[PDB]
Structures are given as structure tokens and as C-alpha cells.
Amino acid sequence: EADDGFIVTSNISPDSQTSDPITKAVRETIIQPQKDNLIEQILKDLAALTDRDLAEQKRKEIEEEKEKDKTLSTFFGNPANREFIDKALEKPELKKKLESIEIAGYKNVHNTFSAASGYPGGFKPVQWENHVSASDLRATVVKNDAGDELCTLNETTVKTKPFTLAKQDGTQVQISSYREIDFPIKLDQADGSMHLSMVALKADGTKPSKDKAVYFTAHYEEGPNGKPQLKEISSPKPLKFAGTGDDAIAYIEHGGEIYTLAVTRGKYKEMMKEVELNQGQSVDLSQAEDIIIGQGQ
């Protein structure tokens, strides 16, 4: 059974001038390969375009940009590429590739930086404490090396709002329980860095096995003022949202099963905004999807 994980700290290298080894590992194993497989799919899709002038223009744009910036920041921020991105993201052959690199990617990150593997201050299971009076809440006080609180994370489990969603093949799945974590955007407590790995939950709110586990990750590095600064996030892609509102829970189809992530649409958009302001590499790659709220279908 997979678990939530955390780290707290207070030419080729593990880190970079602007990032720590965890953030760098997540960019190298998750963020950049997701983009690379996606671009490969877009390039293949361009061969099936009847408009050869457009296919050739788009190909040259992708190739020229890749040579200047491998992170393709301009490509992904250009609304004219949205239809190409969206059409590639609906290909099951791409989805299959993303899934295997995500499972292997998260496993390699957790195994490389695990405290169990011998990495000092490495990933350890999150120690959630059940709320004393609220049955739907758990909390964890994230403390630095000196024992000072960086933040406290609030986990809300929703067990009384069932809804049905659909897999890409039309199969209906009822979500009978999910959770959401109130990830901080800006921190103003103790100094330091913090990395969070929150496991995806199955439709009934239980944890998947270690072999099938995917995560929502959040990367906070010590900023200029000493406070943790949100630099990066990651998740399996494309990310879906159960509904259109800010309260819509993130979900994914992975290995033919549905999982929810501990982030709502409103929280995801706030985190995406902070990541971009802090020059992160994360790209949105998400879509709000239709759902039926209640006990029906």
C-alpha cells in the first residue's frame, strides 16, 4: 500500500542554480518527459493533417523552439497550440506512455530520495493526526530541523457528496469518497524547504498499491526571505476535474482505473499561478469534465 511522503530541510549535478535536487528530479522524471511524449504525439499527428502548409509550419515552430528552450515555455503558453495539444492528449497510445513514465518516475524519485534508502532528511510517510472533534479532518504539522513549524496541512475527506464520472470509453464510475488538501500558496512561518507527495485515492477513498500509485506533488524551496516558496507541482497528465467549479476535485484515469487527487480546481489554478510567477516549468494540461452529482448513474 502506497503512502503520502514529505521532505523538510532548513555540468551535470543533482541540483541547479535555481533549484534543489527534489524539484530537479521531478522536472527530469515527470514534467519534461510528459512534455516530450506529448510533443512526439503532436509531431506524429501533424503527419495526418490534410493541410500540409500548416503541418510543415507547425513542425518548424516546434523544432525551432526545442533548440532554444527544451521546456517549451512559449509553445505551451501559446493559445494557438491548444487544439494540437488537446488532440494529442486524447490519443490512448500517448496516455499509455504517460502512465508508464509516471509510475516509474514517481517510484524513482521516492526511491532516490527516500530516508529508507539512506538519503538524510529524505522522504518519510506523512504523519497525519485525526482531528479531535471533526470526523472528516486530519492535519499534519510540518516542522523544520530546528523543530519550528513551516506550515500545518489540512486534509478534508468528503464522504457525503457522491458523484458519478465517466472514463474515456464511457464507463460510469461512482466516487463515494475523496480528499482535498489545503496546500499553502505563500508561507510566512519558519524558514526552509518542503516537498510533498500525496498519493491518488481509488473511487472508494482507499489508497492504491505501491505498484499502481501516482501522486500530486508540491515543491517549496527556501526563498530570498527564508520562507518556503512554491516552485513546482506535478501530477499524472492530462489532469481532469470533476465539474467546472473551484471545488471540482482533480481526477485521472490510470491503468484503466479512476483515482482522485487531493487538489481542487481552485487550489490547482492558484498553485499553477504561483509556480508560473516563480518561473516553474509546470504546464496546465488539464480539462474540466462533466459529472452527475448525487446517487444517480
Give the DSSP per-residue string, 5-71. Answer: EEEEE----SS-SS--HHHHHHIIIIIHHHHHHHHHHHHHHHHT-S-HHHHHHHHHHHHHHHHH-TT
Instruction: Return the SS3 of 247.
Output: coil
279: cell is 518561473
Phi and psi of 53, rounded to 5°? -65, -45
Residue 166 · residue 155 · CB < 8 Å:
no
Beta bridge partners of 138: 130, 155
> Cβ neighbours of residue 206 under 8 Å, at least 6 residues apart?
none
- Measured CA to CA, the distance from residue 169 to residue 246 in angstroms comes to 26
Chain-centroid distance of CA 186 in Å reads 18
The cell numbers describing 46, all together, are 501533424
Can you read off the three cell numbers belonging to residue 206?
A: 482507499
Q: What phi and psi values does residue 115 have, to the nearest 5 degrees?
A: -70, -35
Would you state the cell numbers that stand for residue 96, as one nine-digit string?
499509455
Structure-determination technique: X-ray
Cα separation, 260 vs 137, whole angstroms: 17
Q: Which of 211, 189, 192, 190 is closest to 200 using CA atoms?
A: 211
Q: Is 157 exposed, middle or buried (0-12, 13-18, 19+ CB in 10 A)?
A: middle
Q: Is-contact 193 221, C-beta < 8 A?
A: yes
Q: Identify any residues that bridge with 253 across adjacent strands, giving them in sequence order.
A: 258
Contact 166, 173 (CB under 8 A): yes
Angle formed by the axes of helices 32-47 and 52-68, to 10°?
A: 160
Q: Which three cell numbers stand for residue 235?
A: 501530477
- Overall domain count for the chain: 1
Residue whose C-alpha cell reads 479532518 in the numeric block: 137
Question: Contact at 8 Å (CB) between 297 and 172?
Answer: yes
Does the bond joining 238 to the residue before it have cis omega, within 30 degrees of 0? Answer: yes
Q: How far apart are CA 55 and CA 155, in angstroms?
A: 47
- Cβ-in-10-Å burial (0-12, 13-18, 19+) of 295 comes to exposed
**Residue 9: strand pairing partners:** 193
Q: Distance between CA atoms of 121 and 214, rounded to whole angstroms?
A: 22
Domain range for residue 141?
Answer: 1-297
**97 C-beta neighbours (distance < 10 Å), count:** 18
φ and ψ of 42, to 5 deg? -60, -45
| Of 202, 204, 219, residue with least CA distance to 259 | 202
Chain CA centroid to CA 270, Å: 13
Q: How far apart are CA 10 and CA 8, in angstroms?
A: 7
